[PDB]
Amino acid sequence: SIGLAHNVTILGSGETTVVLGHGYGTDQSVWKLLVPYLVDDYKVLLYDHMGAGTTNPDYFDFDRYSSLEGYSYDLIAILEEFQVSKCIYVGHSMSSMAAAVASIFRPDLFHKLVMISPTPRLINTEEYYGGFEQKVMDETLRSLDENFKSLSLGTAPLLLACDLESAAMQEYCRTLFNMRPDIACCITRMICGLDLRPYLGHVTVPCHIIQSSNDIMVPVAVGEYLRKNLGGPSVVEVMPTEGHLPHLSMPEVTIPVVLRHIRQDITD
Questions:
Q1: Cα-atom radius of gyration of the chain, to the nearest Å?
Q2: Which architecture, in CATH terms, is 1-268?
Q3: Domain ranges of the chain
Q4: CA–CA separation, 156 vs 163, rounded Å?
Q5: What residues contact residue 125 under an 8 Å CB cut-off, 6+ apart?
Q6: How far apart are CA 18 and CA 40, in angstroms?
Q7: 124 assigned to a ligand binding site
Q8: Which H helix or E strand runs over 251?
């Protein structure tokens, strides 16, 4: 089953289901400090996206996972298999955006989206600043495959805003380097090529946008851009954190913020 292939795990109990979707380089274990605050109040579904190192490489379709939509459609199938609807979806970056796209097709499946460090696109244009320049990205990606480890290790301390020797960095690298290298490079290229801007005005489910104050992958202005372009109601909360994975690296600040957006609706 698709749920088995995504290592679905169910916990808790409750009339409402929270779905936790890890982002790039991690797996559902990233949520281990949040879960205790949910288990008494909600049913919780956790899953691993296809290509995480905990998943079977034989199921990784390089054509489908070269664009984000494959992940969106896989998410719908997982929710359906577990008879989940009107869920509270909590995702980190690409997973939150995969859920946003999914919610256009299946708004019945989503009550709200809680989005940690989302961005609809990385590559700058004349009118949009994503943080990355096309011609630099082209150089980097040309030699990505043979440099995947050295580039990833070299950049991870700024990405995460924590020291190479820290517990958070040990944990991120454990899962990052668990991916098969060719799969990691496929997902990496997919992220780098994102342009989800055309979808945003059709997203109507409420969106709760949680950001670090300093994130090398998400210019702070992207949060406002999302509020102004999403088609439904949203809230933007910038936290006194640094790094792209503040749920991993700064849980003492981040968990309470995530909880509050899970627990408190902005509409009805």
A1: 17
A2: 3-Layer(aba) Sandwich (3.40)
A3: 1-268
A4: 9
A5: none
A6: 12
A7: no
A8: helix 251-263
DSSP-derived 3-state class of residue 115: strand
Torsion sign, CA atoms 221, 204, 191, 34: positive
Which of 48, 74, 93, 249 is catalytic? The answer is: 93
Annotated active-site residue in 208, 244, 247, 261: 244
- Is 49 catalytic? The answer is no
> What are the residues whose beta carbons fall under 8 Å from the beta carbon of 132, sequence distance 6 or more?
122, 123, 124, 192
Which experimental method was this entry solved with?
X-ray
Q: Is 92 a catalytic residue?
A: no
Q: Is 93 a catalytic residue?
A: yes
* Resolution reading in Å: 1.2
d(CA 102, CA 204): 11
**Among the options 111, 212, 215, 247, which is catalytic?**
215
